[PDB]
Design a protein around this motif. Sequence first.
Motif, PDB file in Angstrom:
ATOM      1  N   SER A  33       6.981   1.550  -2.314  1.00 36.03           N
ATOM      2  CA  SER A  33       5.762   1.002  -1.733  1.00 36.03           C
ATOM      3  C   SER A  33       6.032   0.395  -0.364  1.00 36.03           C
ATOM      4  O   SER A  33       7.169   0.038  -0.046  1.00 36.03           O
ATOM      5  CB  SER A  33       5.162  -0.061  -2.659  1.00 36.03           C
ATOM      6  N   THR A  34       4.983   0.292   0.445  1.00 39.75           N
ATOM      7  CA  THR A  34       5.086  -0.287   1.781  1.00 39.75           C
ATOM      8  C   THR A  34       4.417  -1.652   1.681  1.00 39.75           C
ATOM      9  O   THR A  34       3.217  -1.752   1.425  1.00 39.75           O
ATOM     10  CB  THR A  34       4.388   0.607   2.816  1.00 39.75           C
ATOM     11  N   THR A  36       9.176  -0.658   3.825  1.00 41.77           N
ATOM     12  CA  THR A  36       9.052   0.245   2.697  1.00 41.77           C
ATOM     13  C   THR A  36      10.319   0.086   1.874  1.00 41.77           C
ATOM     14  O   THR A  36      11.421   0.049   2.418  1.00 41.77           O
ATOM     15  CB  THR A  36       8.900   1.702   3.168  1.00 41.77           C
ATOM     16  N   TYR A  77       0.847  -1.190   0.000  1.00 39.58           N
ATOM     17  CA  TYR A  77       0.000   0.000   0.000  1.00 39.58           C
ATOM     18  C   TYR A  77       0.885   1.244   0.000  1.00 39.58           C
ATOM     19  O   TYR A  77       2.097   1.147   0.191  1.00 39.58           O
ATOM     20  CB  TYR A  77      -0.936   0.003   1.218  1.00 39.58           C
ATOM     21  N   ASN A  78       0.278   2.407  -0.221  1.00 37.23           N
ATOM     22  CA  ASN A  78       1.019   3.666  -0.261  1.00 37.23           C
ATOM     23  C   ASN A  78       2.079   3.644  -1.352  1.00 37.23           C
ATOM     24  O   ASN A  78       3.183   4.164  -1.176  1.00 37.23           O
ATOM     25  CB  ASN A  78       1.675   3.963   1.094  1.00 37.23           C
TER      26      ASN A  78
END
Length: 101
Positions: free
Chosen positions: A20-21, A31, A9-10
């Motif tokens: 991305s994480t 991350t 996500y992110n």
Amino acid sequence: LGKFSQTCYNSAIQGSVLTSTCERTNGGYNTSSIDLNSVIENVDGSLKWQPSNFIETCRNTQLAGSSELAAECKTRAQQFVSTKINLDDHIANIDGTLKYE
């Protein structure tokens, strides 16, 4: 292959870098980033995945002369043809070490 989006996500893209994480196996997250410049290429206006090698589809590689790379490579039709490329085009001697440029 791939499928990172399902467990991360992110995500974000800045230039050629994807960050991305993502979920770890034991739980928790990390991350990380990956520079896509070396795996994606622009072919006549279309982004395509870049092959990670040529030794999978070419055989009998040899150094012809002092700087020519020669080999037998497979065509789209799956047939082997003779080909060569001058390594002097991009391989330089930088103070005693071979480097691509």
